[PDB]
Amino acid sequence: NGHLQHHPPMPPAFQPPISNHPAPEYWCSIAYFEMDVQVGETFKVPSSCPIVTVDGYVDPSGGDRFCLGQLSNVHRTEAIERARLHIGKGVQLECKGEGDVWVRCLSDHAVFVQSYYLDREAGRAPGDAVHKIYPSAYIKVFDLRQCHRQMQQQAATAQAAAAAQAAAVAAPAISLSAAAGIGVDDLRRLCILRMSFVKGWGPDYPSQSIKETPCWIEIHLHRALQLLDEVLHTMPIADPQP
Amino acid sequence: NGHLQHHPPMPPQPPISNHPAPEYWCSIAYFEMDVQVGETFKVPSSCPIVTVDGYVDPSGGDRFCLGQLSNVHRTEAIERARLHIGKGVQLECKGEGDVWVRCLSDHAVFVQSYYLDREAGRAPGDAVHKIYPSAYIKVFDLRQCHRQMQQQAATAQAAAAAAAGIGVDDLRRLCILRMSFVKGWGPDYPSQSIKETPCWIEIHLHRALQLLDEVLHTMPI
Amino acid sequence: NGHLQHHPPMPPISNHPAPEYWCSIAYFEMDVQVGETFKVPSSCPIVTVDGYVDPSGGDRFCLGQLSNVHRTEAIERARLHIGKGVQLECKGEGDVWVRCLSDHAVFVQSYYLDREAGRAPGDAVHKIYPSAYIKVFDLRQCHRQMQQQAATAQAAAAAQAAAVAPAISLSAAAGIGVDDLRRLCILRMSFVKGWGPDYPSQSIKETPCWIEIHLHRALQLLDEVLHTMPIADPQP
């Protein structure tokens, strides 16, 4: 069974916005890692730069292109050096619609994405799969609507398991309250993308997690995070329960 | 000796320097145990009130959410704790550079403040002030700080004729606040230091820091 | 041997628009980076890096207030001596200068100074004495060295292909020699303590407090240079 989903290149107004909330100043923020160490600062991408490029070149300017070639890292090994060599033209993260995200592998080597969307699209379990994107391939890795639906659902699901454990253990004088933020470290996960350049991880590979690959990045989508937060704030408040 | 001060909720001059107002009145740095997580959050002077909660909106400005942040080194222990940060708290800046904390979290907040140290009559830095939910305590008085950094630098300087000689790295601490969410530290707790707690934040007060710079250029250490 | 060098007090290359910042400075304590990367606006041609505490940012980086849970007594002793630190000035399109204001000299790592001193690239330490005001980076010289270096990289690679089963295609890496190149655009200086043979600190990252300075304009020029390299085309 393919834990590794392959993604080869495939050459070619009626519905309101998801939220009235105004767009963010940045549509996403990107943190680059070498193994379990973050190299360089977090790169923010203005919502006015619908396409950001992350290659292995050296221009520091910022804005819509985030270079990794010039970054230093005192702990860097000879392996990370080998890998960093092949990043090259890297990838393009394109933001369409309110907050949909696409990836364009411009590198000569395949990139390995970690996306909850792609997981669902492959009939796989959440987080159980590595999506390999072949050089030149151009595929959608995140759908705002799909994510939003999932959030409200998961959020509800949790809120219930809240009153569940609540009525569970629940004599003297004692009060109960839902953990101010149940299932949050999980809903946020739905708003974060990740991708490893050159090297892939998982069963078929020596790297077991992405934290074990020479050079990857973690993409935080803000418009998704805006929604989610807005969702968390539409839940019954933790009112002490005798 | 009552190392832990208790702050339950109890319902209710001109500028010190001509020096210009800070771009940001403070900057917060969130840590998990002894690792800094996220970027350092900087609060504009036009945002006299900042909220640090456990939610997930990444926007800048007056709200710093620790919920969406990641940490490869994160542990179950830390996660379980982050679970209760909730409404978090509100750090407020009054006057030229005074600071007040307002706990909104359902659970206590343990602040490390020199100002409170004096009020509680404890030896400087030998106390952990526990802010109870809904409490609206004042944690930093600019004027006092100013009075203190001067004297402390004056004595640290005069102590050159010789320990008593403090360097920048001791005076700067007068301009910094620190607080832990949910968990507390001290002798009555497993965590002996703040950097040994699941989630806390170090707060740098910029107005106070300026005064200190202005002071290290008159009473050189 | 002369690994340690002593420096006591004694037209546009591109149309590409001037960088937003002319350099990015990162502060380190041993092998740890304390504080955030300070970015200097091009409008602040001279930035000051001292050991004081104004957080104001802009044209002055203070390492005084910065915190580090890993800090030690040795690093604390060392920070004590940074004082007025240094001044990094930017002349022209991208030339960098250093003026030691500290009472203690500092030790820069400058590929340009290496060229001048007639020493193997990167194999030297330049000690800037208090009061000294010496040039440490030259764009023109840097630009010229880049191209010839990138070019040598290329040749070497293609010469690696010939050095090699017919039914298979071979190909050269995209980032060939890209590291050593970008290094030509970065400066490093250690306050108070030097490093090298004559020192108990064998490398910059073994010193209590140093900074790495990324020269922006130079980095752009190298980007263009890199984008003028023959696209990698797998030959069978």
CA distance readout (Å), A242 to A158, A237, B95, B158, C79: 21, 15, 42, 61, 56
Among the partner residues B27, B29, B168, nearest to C64 by beta-carbon distance: B168
Annotate B43-59 with b (16+ C-beta within 10 A) or e (fewer): beeebeebbbbbbbbbe
Q: Give the residue on A whose Cα is nearest the Cα of C36.
A: A41
Cβ <8 Å between C54 and B213: yes
Strand ranges of the sheet holding C95-100, from the earlier edge strand across to the other edge: C60-62, C46-50, C86-91, C95-100, C133-137
- Reported as half-sphere exposure (CB side, CA atoms, 13 A), residue B18 has a value of 0
Q: Give the residue on B whose Cα is nearest the Cα of A209.
A: B72
CATH code: domain of residue A34: 2.60.200.10
From A197's Cα to the closest Cα of chain C, the distance in A is: 13
Torsion sign (Cα): A35, A204, A56, A8: negative
To probe the interface with A, which of B37, B56, B59, B78 has the most A CB atoms within 10 Å? B56
- The resolution in angstroms reads 3.0
The two beta strands, B35-36 and B24-32, are antiparallel
- Number of domains composing chain C: 1
First and final CA of chain C: distance in angstroms?
47
Q: Give the residue on C whose Cα is nearest the Cα of A67.
A: C223
Q: Which residues contact C55 (CB under 8 A, 6 or more apart)?
A: B22, B24, B27, B204, B206, B209, B210, C62, C65
Do C173 and C157 meet the contact criterion of CB atoms below 8 Å apart?
A: yes
Q: C59 CB near a chain B CB, below 8 Å?
A: no
Do A84 and A119 meet the contact criterion of CB atoms below 8 Å apart?
A: no
Neighboring chain B residues of A228 at a CB cutoff of 8 Å = 56
Per the DSSP assignment, residues forming a β-bridge with A76 are: none
Among the partner residues B22, B168, B176, nearest to C51 by beta-carbon distance: B168
Structure tokens given for C139: 């764009």
Cβ <8 Å between B59 and A33: no
d(CA B119, CA C31): 40
Estimate the share of chain A in helix, then strand, then coil, as percent rounded to the nearest 5.
25, 25, 45
Q: C180 CB near a chain A CB, below 8 Å?
A: no
The two beta strands, B176-181 and C125-128, are unpaired
Q: Give the residue on B whose Cα is nearest the Cα of A228.
A: B56
CA distance readout (Å), A219 to B53, B202, C177: 22, 26, 28
Structure tokens given for B188: 């009555």
Structure tokens given for C53: 């505490």
Report CA Rg, chain B.
18
Method: X-ray
Cβ <8 Å between A220 and B73: no
Neighboring chain B residues of C62 at a CB cutoff of 8 Å = 213
Q: Which residues contact C192 (CB under 8 A, 6 or more apart)?
A: C78, C81, C82, C102, C104, C106, C207, C208, C209
Q: C97 CB near a chain B CB, below 8 Å?
A: no
- Reported as half-sphere exposure (CB side, CA atoms, 13 A), residue B13 has a value of 6
Structure tokens given for A27: 């549509």
What would the DSSP string read from start to end of A49-91? -SEEEEESS-----SSEEE-TT---TT--HHHHHHHHHHTT-E
Q: CA B116 from chain center: how many Å? A: 11
Annotate A11-41 with b (16+ C-beta within 10 A) or e (fewer): eeeeeeebbeeeebebbbbbbbbbbeebbbb
d(CA B181, CA B107): 8
d(CA B189, CA C231): 62
To probe the interface with B, which of A38, A47, A175, A188 has the most B CB atoms within 10 Å? A188
- Quote the crossing angle between the two packed helices B142-158 and B206-215, to the nearest 10°: 30
Among the partner residues C53, C57, C67, nearest to B212 by beta-carbon distance: C53
Q: Which residues contact C228 (CB under 8 A, 6 or more apart)?
A: none
Torsion sign (Cα): C2, C152, C189, C29: negative
Q: CA A187 from chain center: how many Å? A: 11
Judged by DSSP in three states, C125 sits in: strand
Judged by DSSP in three states, A161 sits in: helix
d(CA A216, CA A87): 10
Q: B90 CB near a chain C CB, below 8 Å?
A: no
Count CB neighbours of C220 within 10 A: 22
Q: A60 CB near a chain C CB, below 8 Å?
A: yes
Neighboring chain C residues of B209 at a CB cutoff of 8 Å = 53-55, 65
Do B99 and B137 meet the contact criterion of CB atoms below 8 Å apart?
A: no
What is the span of the domain harbouring residue B180? 1-221
Q: What angle do CA B111, B114, B118 make, to 5 degrees?
A: 115
From A189's Cα to the closest Cα of chain C, the distance in A is: 26
From B58's Cα to the closest Cα of chain A, the distance in A is: 6
Q: Which residues contact C140 (CB under 8 A, 6 or more apart)?
A: C13
Q: Could you tell me which of C14, C38, C10, C12 has the C-alpha nearest to residue C24?
A: C38
CA distance readout (Å), B106 to A238, B56, B130, B180, C39: 8, 18, 13, 14, 39
Q: C36 CB near a chain B CB, below 8 Å?
A: yes
d(CA C214, CA A72): 10
Neighboring chain C residues of A44 at a CB cutoff of 8 Å = none
Q: Which amino acid is at B60?
A: G
Q: Could you tell me which of A153, A164, A192 has the C-alpha nearest to residue A42?
A: A192
Q: A108 CB near a chain C CB, below 8 Å?
A: yes
Do B172 and B203 meet the contact criterion of CB atoms below 8 Å apart?
A: no
Structure tokens given for C134: 């010496």
- Reported as half-sphere exposure (CB side, CA atoms, 13 A), residue C117 has a value of 24
Judged by DSSP in three states, B150 sits in: helix
Locate breaks in chain B with C to N over 2.5 A; list the residue preceding each: 12, 162
Do C216 and C21 meet the contact criterion of CB atoms below 8 Å apart?
A: yes
Torsion sign (Cα): A104, A106, A108, A113: negative
Q: Which chains touch B (3 or more CB pairs under 8 A)?
A: A, C
From B78's Cα to the closest Cα of chain A, the distance in A is: 11
Torsion sign (Cα): C94, C97, C101, C103: positive
Among the partner residues B39, B172, B195, nearest to C65 by beta-carbon distance: B172
Q: Give the residue on B whose Cα is nearest the Cα of A192.
A: B68
Judged by DSSP in three states, A233 sits in: coil
Q: B120 CB near a chain C CB, below 8 Å?
A: no
Do C38 and C63 meet the contact criterion of CB atoms below 8 Å apart?
A: no
Q: C133 CB near a chain B CB, below 8 Å?
A: no
Q: Please tell me what DSSP assigns to residue B194.
A: G
Judged by DSSP in three states, C86 sits in: strand
Q: C74 CB near a chain A CB, below 8 Å?
A: no
> What 3 state SS string does B119-131 have?
HCCCCCCCCEEEE
Question: For chain A, give me the number of helices (H) and strands (E)?
Answer: 5, 13
Q: Give the residue on A whose Cα is nearest the Cα of B38.
A: A42
d(CA A27, CA C62): 32
Cβ <8 Å between B209 and C55: yes
d(CA B87, CA A75): 38
Which single residue is written with the structure tokens 């920048």? B168
Q: Could you tell me which of B110, B100, B115, B99 has the C-alpha nearest to residue B133?
A: B110
Per the DSSP assignment, residues forming a β-bridge with C108 are: C126, C189
Which single residue is written with the structure tokens 């997580």? B37
Where does residue C163 rank: exposed (0-12), middle (13-18), buried (19+ CB within 10 A)?
A: exposed
Q: A90 CB near a chain C CB, below 8 Å?
A: no
d(CA B2, CA C171): 71
Which single residue is written with the structure tokens 């004056």? B154
Q: Could you tell me which of A6, A52, A56, A13 has the C-alpha nearest to residue A34?
A: A56
Structure tokens given for A212: 């074990």
Q: Which chains touch A (3 or more CB pairs under 8 A)?
A: B, C
From A108's Cα to the closest Cα of chain C, the distance in A is: 8
Which single residue is written with the structure tokens 């802009």? C58
Q: B169 CB near a chain C CB, below 8 Å?
A: yes
Where does residue A134 rank: exposed (0-12), middle (13-18), buried (19+ CB within 10 A)?
A: middle
Q: CA C130 from chain center: how many Å? A: 20
d(CA B191, CA B186): 6
Do A197 and A111 meet the contact criterion of CB atoms below 8 Å apart?
A: yes
Do C193 and C105 meet the contact criterion of CB atoms below 8 Å apart?
A: no
Do C157 and C38 meet the contact criterion of CB atoms below 8 Å apart?
A: no
What would the DSSP string read from start to end of C140-186? HHHHHHHHHHHHHHHHHHHHHHTT---SS-B---TTTTHHHHHHTTE
CA distance readout (Å), A191 to A184, B11, B56, B109: 11, 41, 10, 29
Structure tokens given for A232: 């968390």
Judged by DSSP in three states, C22 sits in: strand
From B9's Cα to the closest Cα of chain C, the distance in A is: 32
Do A24 and A226 meet the contact criterion of CB atoms below 8 Å apart?
A: yes
Pure H helices in chain C: 73-80, 111-116, 139-161, 178-183, 216-226
Q: Which amino acid is at A148?
A: H
Torsion angles phi and psi, residue C37, rounded to 5: -70, 115
